[PDB]
Amino acid sequence: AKHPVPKKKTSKARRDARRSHHALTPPTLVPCPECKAMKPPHTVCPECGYYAGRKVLEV
Amino acid sequence: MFAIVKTGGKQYRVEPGLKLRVEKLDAEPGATVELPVLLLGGEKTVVGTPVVEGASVVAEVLGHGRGKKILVSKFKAKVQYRRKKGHRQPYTELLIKEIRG
Amino acid sequence: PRAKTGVVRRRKHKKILKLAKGYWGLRSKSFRKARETLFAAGNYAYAHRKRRKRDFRRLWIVRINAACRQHGLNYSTFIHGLKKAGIEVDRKNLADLAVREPQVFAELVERAKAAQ
Amino acid sequence: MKTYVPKQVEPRWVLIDAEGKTLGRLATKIATLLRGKHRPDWTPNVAMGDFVVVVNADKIRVTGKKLEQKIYTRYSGYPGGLKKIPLEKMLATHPERVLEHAVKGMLPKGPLGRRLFKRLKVYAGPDHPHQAQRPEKLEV
Amino acid sequence: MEAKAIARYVRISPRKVRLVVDLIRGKSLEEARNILRYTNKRGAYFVAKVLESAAANAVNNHDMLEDRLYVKAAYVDEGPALKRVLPRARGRADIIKKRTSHITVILGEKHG
Amino acid sequence: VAYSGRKIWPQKHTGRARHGDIGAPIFVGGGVVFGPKPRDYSYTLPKKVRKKGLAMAVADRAREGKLLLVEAFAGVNGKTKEFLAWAKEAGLDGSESVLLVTGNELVRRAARNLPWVVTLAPEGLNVYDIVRTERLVMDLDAWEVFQNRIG
RNA sequence: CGUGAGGGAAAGGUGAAAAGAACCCCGGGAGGGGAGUGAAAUAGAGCCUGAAACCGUGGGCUUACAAGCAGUCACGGCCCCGAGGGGUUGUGGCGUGCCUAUUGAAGCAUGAGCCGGCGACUCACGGUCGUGGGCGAGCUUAAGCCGUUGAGGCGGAGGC
RNA sequence: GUGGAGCCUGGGAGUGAGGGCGCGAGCGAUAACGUCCGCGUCCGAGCGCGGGAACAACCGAGACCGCCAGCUAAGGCCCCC
RNA sequence: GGAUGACCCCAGGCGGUAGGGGAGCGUUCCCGAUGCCGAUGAAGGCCGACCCGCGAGGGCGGCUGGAGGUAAGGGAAGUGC
Numbered sequence A: 001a002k003h004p005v006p007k008k009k010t011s012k013a014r015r016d017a018r019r020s021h022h023a024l025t026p027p028t029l030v031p032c033p034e035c036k037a038m039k040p041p042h043t044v045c046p047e048c049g050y051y052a053g054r055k056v057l058e059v
Numbered sequence B: 001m002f003a004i005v006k007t008g009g010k011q012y013r014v015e016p017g018l019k020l021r022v023e024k025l026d027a028e029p030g031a032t033v034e035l036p037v038l039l040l041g042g043e044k045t046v047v048g049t050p051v052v053e054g055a056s057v058v059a060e061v062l063g064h065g066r067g068k069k070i071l072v073s074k075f076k077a078k079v080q081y082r083r084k085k086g087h088r089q090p091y092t093e094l095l096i097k098e099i100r101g
Numbered sequence C: 001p002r003a004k005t006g007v008v009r010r011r012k013h014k015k016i017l018k019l020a021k022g023y024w025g026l027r028s029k030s031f032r033k034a035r036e037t038l039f040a041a042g043n044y045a046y047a048h049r050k051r052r053k054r055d056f057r058r059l060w061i062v063r064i065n066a067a068c069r070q071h072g073l074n075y076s077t078f079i080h081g082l083k084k085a086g087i088e089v090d091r092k093n094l095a096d097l098a099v100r101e102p103q104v105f106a107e108l109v110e111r112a113k114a115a116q
Numbered sequence D: 001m002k003t004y005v006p007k008q009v010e011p012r013w014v015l016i017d018a019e020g021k022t023l024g025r026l027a028t029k030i031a032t033l034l035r036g037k038h039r040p041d042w043t044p045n046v047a048m049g050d051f052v053v054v055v056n057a058d059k060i061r062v063t064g065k066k067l068e069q070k071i072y073t074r075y076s077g078y079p080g081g082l083k084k085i086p087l088e089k090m091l092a093t094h095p096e097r098v099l100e101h102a103v104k105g106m107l108p109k110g111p112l113g114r115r116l117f118k119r120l121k122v123y124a125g126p127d128h129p130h131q132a133q134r135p136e137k138l139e140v
Numbered sequence E: 001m002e003a004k005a006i007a008r009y010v011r012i013s014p015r016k017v018r019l020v021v022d023l024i025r026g027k028s029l030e031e032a033r034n035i036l037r038y039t040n041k042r043g044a045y046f047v048a049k050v051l052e053s054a055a056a057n058a059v060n061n062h063d064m065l066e067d068r069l070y071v072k073a074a075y076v077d078e079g080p081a082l083k084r085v086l087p088r089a090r091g092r093a094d095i096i097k098k099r100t101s102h103i104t105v106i107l108g109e110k111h112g
Numbered sequence F: 001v002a003y004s005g006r007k008i009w010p011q012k013h014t015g016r017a018r019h020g021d022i023g024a025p026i027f028v029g030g031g032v033v034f035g036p037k038p039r040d041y042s043y044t045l046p047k048k049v050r051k052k053g054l055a056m057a058v059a060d061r062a063r064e065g066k067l068l069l070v071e072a073f074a075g076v077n078g079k080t081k082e083f084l085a086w087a088k089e090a091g092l093d094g095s096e097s098v099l100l101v102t103g104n105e106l107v108r109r110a111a112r113n114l115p116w117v118v119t120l121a122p123e124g125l126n127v128y129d130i131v132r133t134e135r136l137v138m139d140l141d142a143w144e145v146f147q148n149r150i151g
Numbered sequence G: 001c002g003u004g005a006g007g008g009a010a011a012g013g014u015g016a017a018a019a020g021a022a023c024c025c026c027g028g029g030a031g032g033g034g035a036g037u038g039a040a041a042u043a044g045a046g047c048c049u050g051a052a053a054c055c056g057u058g059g060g061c062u063u064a065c066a067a068g069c070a071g072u073c074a075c076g077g078c079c080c081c082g083a084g085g086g087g088u089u090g091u092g093g094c095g096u097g098c099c100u101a102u103u104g105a106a107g108c109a110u111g112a113g114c115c116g117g118c119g120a121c122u123c124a125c126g127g128u129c130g131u132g133g134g135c136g137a138g139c140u141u142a143a144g145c146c147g148u149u150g151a152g153g154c155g156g157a158g159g160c
Numbered sequence H: 001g002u003g004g005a006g007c008c009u010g011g012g013a014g015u016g017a018g019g020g021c022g023c024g025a026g027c028g029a030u031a032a033c034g035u036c037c038g039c040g041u042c043c044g045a046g047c048g049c050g051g052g053a054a055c056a057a058c059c060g061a062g063a064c065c066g067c068c069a070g071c072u073a074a075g076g077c078c079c080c081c
Numbered sequence I: 001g002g003a004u005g006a007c008c009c010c011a012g013g014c015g016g017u018a019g020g021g022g023a024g025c026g027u028u029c030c031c032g033a034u035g036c037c038g039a040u041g042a043a044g045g046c047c048g049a050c051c052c053g054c055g056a057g058g059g060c061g062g063c064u065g066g067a068g069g070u071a072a073g074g075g076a077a078g079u080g081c
């Protein structure tokens, strides 16, 4: 190897174009059928401890 | 009815009521002037050869002024030749009063 | 006494940078780049001032030519006829006539044919 | 007085019977119609020419031995990707491409001329599907 | 009426926090809280506190209603960077910049 | 400059520009190039020019009529209020700046503090002071030695 | 920093006065929001002014069939300010960075990431022309002495 | 022949790496974007402008500034143009 | 022309590297200044499509800034990146 190196400074425009994919997708959340609080689906509700209609966990 | 006149080495189509910018004329503001006619048209049509004898266009001079500054710049690379010159072209403003056919 | 740069240089740079507004990237933001662009733009203007006078005449000639061929003759014939007729109405006006006042242009075409 | 500039006008449709005509000489006229340089109000920065429909493209005629000797060419970008197709075959396979390729090279390069070539509708065989546009038959 | 809160000199790199701040701009206060709660980023903690502190000021100081609040505006500016040495091979020293953020959240009321 | 004479880094092969010592005027904190040093700005203007200048300066005032000669200074004895008396009495209300030239120390002490008055011993007469002022007022004893210098 | 001789930095400014922000609110704190001080608090101690590069937020115009030293000239669309002008750029025309070095550079030859500040034809004495004045077969003083305390004079040794 | 002509005294330089082209030679191989002289020219310093597809020195022509006026030079007039 | 750089009229010159010459602009400082501008706002900063100048620049107006600045005319340089 012979130590490759950038030929030109990346423009503000080109830098920012590269970052057109870097945006975050907001978390996917559904209401908990017991306490109405929002939570990730398929996860035991951290607010009331309910999953599949029953208490699973102390919160 | 329009007319084609010739002032300051250039030609323009004029109708009464029109305001016009031409090259500077040696005439006090407010005075009126007669411009040479190359062609009359609209109702009748007369073709100057090159000018039309009896016809003239009477214009009142509204004033004289200087055009907005243009920057004419000269640059020659690898030589340190650079020139900056500011140019405002003189002009006179006319109001076309009548077309004497 | 001492006369340090002080205020003078910033001011000279701002003159340039204001003149370079609108340009792309560092050309409107960096003094040095602004200057290099402004040099080119000065020569371009001067050159294009001179060539604008050409750009229009060629349009005028194309338009005059279009109206001439409607009456069965070409531009090169039309101009010669006008010269022989002694008509000195310019191409800026001939073109305006060709479009705005077609019957007036027709008459000129007539005198052009009559001249030869 | 500044030079007249036309606002957009309704485009005229034109029909041409290409049968028996000399390829290159018909090409120029269509280019002209496309540009709109036959209109007294011509303006170079807008699409204001005619729409040109051409029929009997396959029945275009050509002088000399070009039918065998004119080689149309296409490069794919791959090694050894230079394809040579003679005129004979081009008429035998996609005849309307002949008038098209000719007219295209006589139109200006860039965005506008590229869109002018879109105003050229060329068909081999006497029939064209633009009866809706009611094209004006031109002798050229 | 608006209410704002600014956390200055937060020891996190502006580029990282903005990613999170962008997630809640123009959202209802309730929706934003829901998002920050389940966003898997370090920045979420910081953006959260500034959001709550801004909501607090709205209810307390500025006569606004918690049930009307939304994130009208939000942005991160960059503060003074913390420069630190990072020893490299063959005796060379590099300089790491541990950056800093000024997080701003501005809250408004959605009437109806 | 105070710094050392050592070459700060080797001539070649560092990837930096070449340098000598940091006292070089190219460096910040380094010496100055062609800056000021102690200097004697005086020169010997031709005596005949100076003398001629004195005469000319007085003449110019004399021609304006701004020159006044006085025989003695009435009641002035070292008090400013006293000079103002006499000054007013002579047509000197302070609306014009006056160079007062006299050997009477007592008269100079009384008039020195006036904003509109410059004071001079007759040996000290000089064209700058004359040109600076609007009026020239002279003791006859002063006007006498003035005559001697320009003679 | 260097074993050592030795090398050798950076770093000044709230306000007239601390009157340096009691108390309350969110926060573990930091920070901030109100309250209060002040003529002024984007004078809040990370404090006069606060340029530029650089980063961001909001708004207007614009861009996903297009070939480019990035501009320039023309026309048109849109936005703004009220026969005009400002911003923007769709299409058309034209168009080989700056500097340095070279016979010749856009050059695939040198230098330069960008911005700000430092940065190079001076001074003394002598010489040689030119030039503005003074005196002119003459012109001029030097060290010193007296005077002044930003006052000028004396001094003829000497030099041309 | 009154010309940014010429001659005389003096102040100030810069240059003392040239290059293409045409014609006349030597050298080379009736080779070189070769080399060394001569007369001229242009580029150098006119990498400003029109032509030669593009191209310092080939053809045209010496750019004080402005004009949306006119005439021409070389080169051109089927379309790109 | 008028008599003198008063302004007007007619005519011709005005590509330019090394380089010679000329005229100016601006920066710090001194005399002018015991003066004058200044909290009804100094300098400096950010604007401007306005005014004067070929240009370097100089004005004027808006915002910022909050205590300095400095004319006509002359003088001297650590004087323009």
Ligand SMILES: [Mg+2]
Binding pocket: A001, A002
């Ligand atoms: Mg390897």
Ligand SMILES: [Mg+2]
Binding pocket: A001, A002
């Ligand atoms: Mg390798």
Ligand SMILES: [Mg+2]
Binding pocket: A001, A002, A003, A004
């Ligand atoms: Mg590698």
Ligand SMILES: [Mg+2]
Binding pocket: A001
């Ligand atoms: Mg290896």
Ligand SMILES: [Mg+2]
Binding pocket: A003, A004, A005
């Ligand atoms: Mg590598």
Ligand SMILES: [Mg+2]
Binding pocket: A005, A006, A007, A008
């Ligand atoms: Mg590289």
Ligand SMILES: [Mg+2]
Binding pocket: A010, A011, A012, A015
């Ligand atoms: Mg960047």
Ligand SMILES: [Mg+2]
Binding pocket: A012, A016
């Ligand atoms: Mg951006």
Ligand SMILES: [Mg+2]
Binding pocket: A014, A015, A017, A018
């Ligand atoms: Mg990229």
Ligand SMILES: [Mg+2]
Binding pocket: A040
């Ligand atoms: Mg998950």
Ligand SMILES: [Mg+2]
Binding pocket: A047, A059
């Ligand atoms: Mg619980």
Ligand SMILES: [Mg+2]
Binding pocket: B006, B007, B008, B009, B010
């Ligand atoms: Mg005329």
Ligand SMILES: [Mg+2]
Binding pocket: B017, B018, B019
């Ligand atoms: Mg009208």
Ligand SMILES: [Mg+2]
Binding pocket: B022, B023, B024, B089, B090, B091, B092
């Ligand atoms: Mg004029």
Ligand SMILES: [Mg+2]
Binding pocket: B021, B022, B023, B089, B090, B091
């Ligand atoms: Mg005009």
Ligand SMILES: [Mg+2]
Binding pocket: B076, B077, B079, H047
């Ligand atoms: Mg050049």
